[PDB]
Amino acid sequence: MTMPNGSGGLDPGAWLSHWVNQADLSSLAGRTEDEVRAYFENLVQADSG
Amino acid sequence: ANNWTDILAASDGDEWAAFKTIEAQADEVRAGHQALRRAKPLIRLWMNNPDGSEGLVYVGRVDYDDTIRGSFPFKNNTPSQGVLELRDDNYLAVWLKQLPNNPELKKNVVITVDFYGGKKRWSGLLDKWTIKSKEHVKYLEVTFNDDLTMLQYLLCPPNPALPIPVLQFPRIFGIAGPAKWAISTLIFINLFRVQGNLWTLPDDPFNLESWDDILDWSDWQCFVKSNSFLLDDSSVWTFLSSRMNPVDSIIADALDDAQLTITYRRVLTDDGETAEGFPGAHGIKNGALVFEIVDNSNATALEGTFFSGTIVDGFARSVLLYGGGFVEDTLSVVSDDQTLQPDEYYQSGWLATMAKMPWLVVRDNEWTPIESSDLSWGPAKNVSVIVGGDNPAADAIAKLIIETTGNLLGYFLLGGFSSAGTIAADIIMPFLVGTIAAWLQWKNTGRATELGWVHYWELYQQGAETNSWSLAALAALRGGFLVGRSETVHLMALHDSWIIPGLHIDIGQRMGSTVNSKGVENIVWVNQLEEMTAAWDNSAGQTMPLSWVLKAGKSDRAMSIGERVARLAKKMSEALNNVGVHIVQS
Amino acid sequence: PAADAIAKLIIETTGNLLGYFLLGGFSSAGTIAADIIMPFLVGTIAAWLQWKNTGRATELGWVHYWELYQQGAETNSWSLAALAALRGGFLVGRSETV
Secondary structure, rough: OEOOOOOOHOOOOOOHHHEEOOOOOHHHHHOOHHHHHHHHHHHHHHHHO | OHHHHHHHHHOOHHHHHHHHHHHHHHHHHHHHHHHHHHHOOOEEEEEEOOOOOOEEEEEEEEOOOOOOEEEEEOOOOOOOEEEEEEEOOOOOHHHHHHOOOOOOOOOOOEEEEOOOOOOHHHHEEEEEEEEEOOOEEEEEEEEEEOOHHHHHHEOOOOOOOOOOOOOOOOOOEEEEEEEEEHHHHHHHHHHHHOOOOOOOOOOOOOOOOOOOOOOOOOOOOOEOOOOOOOOOOOOOOOEEEOEEEEHHHHHHHHHHHHHHHEEEEOOHHHHHOOOOOOOOOOOOOOOOEEEEOOOOOOOOOOOEEEEEEOOOOOOEEEEEEEEOOHEEEEEEEOOOOOOOOHHHOOOOOOOOOOOOOOOOOOOOOOOEEEEEEEEEEEEOOOEEEEEEEOHHHHHHHHHHHHHHHHHHHHHHHOOOEEEEEOOOOOHHHHOOOOOOOOOOEEEEEHHHHHHHHOOOOEEEEOOOOOOOOOOOOOHHHHHHOOOOOOEEEEEEEOOOOOOOEEOEEOOOOOEEEOOOOOOOOEEEEEEEEEEEEEEEEEOHHHHHEEEEEEOOOOOOOOOOOOHHHHHHHHHHHHHHHHHHHHOOOO | OOOOOHHHHHHHHHHHHHHHHOOOOOOOOOOOOOOHHHHHHHEEOOOOOOOOOOOHHHHHOOOOOOOOOOOOOOOOOOOOOOOHHHHHHHHOOOOOOO
16 A cells, blocks of 8 residues: 655655645634635536536 | 783793683673573563543562563564463462452553563563463463564554544545555554644655644554654655555555565653654653664665675675566675675674664574474475555546536537437446556566466455555556465574574574575575564473573465464455445435 | 435535536636535535544553454444444443353
8 A cells, every 4th residue: 555656656646745744734624614615616517528 | 902922921922821711701791691591581560540631650580480481472563462371379460360350550561571681672562361270270361462463553644633423534545655654654643643633734744844843752552763754764655545544554565565664662761761753752751662674674775784694605685676667676686795784893892783783593403492393495386476456546426427427418519429420529438447557557577487387377466455556556556466475484592502592683684594404404594583582481280481482584385374364364354344345425 | 324314415505516616606606505515425424434442441451452443233223323333332342251
């Protein structure tokens, strides 16, 4: 379960790749209802179809 | 630094007298080593404070001569059970028996067994006790669980920094970084959460300048010590994912792949011991547990380590070389090995084994101080591994609803359902759930080359977290290839050998061993130490002095059937919990 | 299931998205939406029940095992009976005499 290379072992295109923590653990407390709601509303607004 | 000329002058020019002086010094050093090896253990029982405050409170001490029998194993990254049998007239046995019905006492008891003046310590919580009758003679058999069982009851929620029954986003928690830092950080975040999430988490918990100095950590029962994200020297990274999984289950695969060791130490400040290197390390209370991830094997290091050797030229240094995609790692021998010796090897009174320079080779021949129980080797099994299932990046339910209904509405407004002329844009996504890039197959070229024409083909591997391979493809493949590999395990019993377990060699540290069997006399099997049990029996019938049994290396093949069934059952239960929590409601 | 059942995720989200679309939300971001992101939050809203046994903590003391995840006999019933599910979970790691 170890990645011999560095951060390049992660997949940037994964579904939850934006939520993988590396050293920004202060952002965990920012994952409340309002912020997640705004993020996903932005995505749905940007939806192309 | 007494030179030969100085010693000869002190002996008045008599070479025989000078050499007798040197021999006496060597004899006194050997006698000190033997006394350290044969020293009795110190067994002490501690309890929680009856008023409910912090700090373990000293209950008492069990004499080694007053024991009936005892058995304490130290295992690599695995919980172990310690067993202590006492006579029921013993005062600590009486105290333990009165404990369940004593309303003035807390019900948790901690045992600490100290070897070599506290240098080696086995500490653990009480699991149970049993009053057993051997021919109308009653004795108390007391079972403790070692302090690595706390990681089974520590679990990582999707958002450890937020209230659990309110909103736990995202679905799983994923942390990526240097291996030691990430494991220690996961443990620390869960410790913070379970202690109360009272304060705000900084970016890096182990950047000690981020934590305020006014903060009080004395109420914490467990601590984790590690270097910062930037200062961590772990060569390889790791990705750890969890959806309410236990911490030990989360970190087992990473620890195995990086050959890392979890070391626990219960800091008895009543003995004068102190701790440093973690937040609040100065105000910790008596009997507080501290965890540390260490690299005792040094297999992933830049300079490599010793993976093999022969009794006629010692160990051989090899370094890991990673193939395409870093899934496969082979060993390349350092032809001109010029690694400097550790500075600790030049210090008086040092006995430990440094990770960078293993030294302990245990030889078996006609005149051997040990007994070798069994040495088993088995080749690798499966050339290729398949890991996968569904790929959420392609057919997540949110996509399947929103994007597909938008595409269908666009097609409808263009008039596709009125007449087939219109060209659609992905209106069939719900029909292809689990089919687009849903798998990862890797064939281990090195394993195939080592195995040959006749071999087992492939194996499907399900990870500890069911939906994390898409997040870390490489980590999933390496964890899958952790299973069916070449396995060597050797059992030793050190009866009166000069080897001092814990002092000369520790858990997770590489050592070589030989077996007096024709064809492999010269070969040295180099494995990282995995188990060592200290056991004794004071019974009149059979009386066994305190003896150590080592198990170097690990093998699923030579593991007993009961142990295999238990390990499989544990993994199956964890996977069942993960699948059940990943179930989508109807 | 009371928050992200598949029936909800389909019908309610499709209706909300259609209302937003007809108002013109995708034409220009000015419109304020009403829960068009429900499928994105599956398994995250009120999905857990955590209970700390104060009596057990008082019995045990400063040093104790922290927590345990428990799966019920019926995997989709805790939302129907929270209290029963919590008591069934606490049935496991208790003081035992035999």
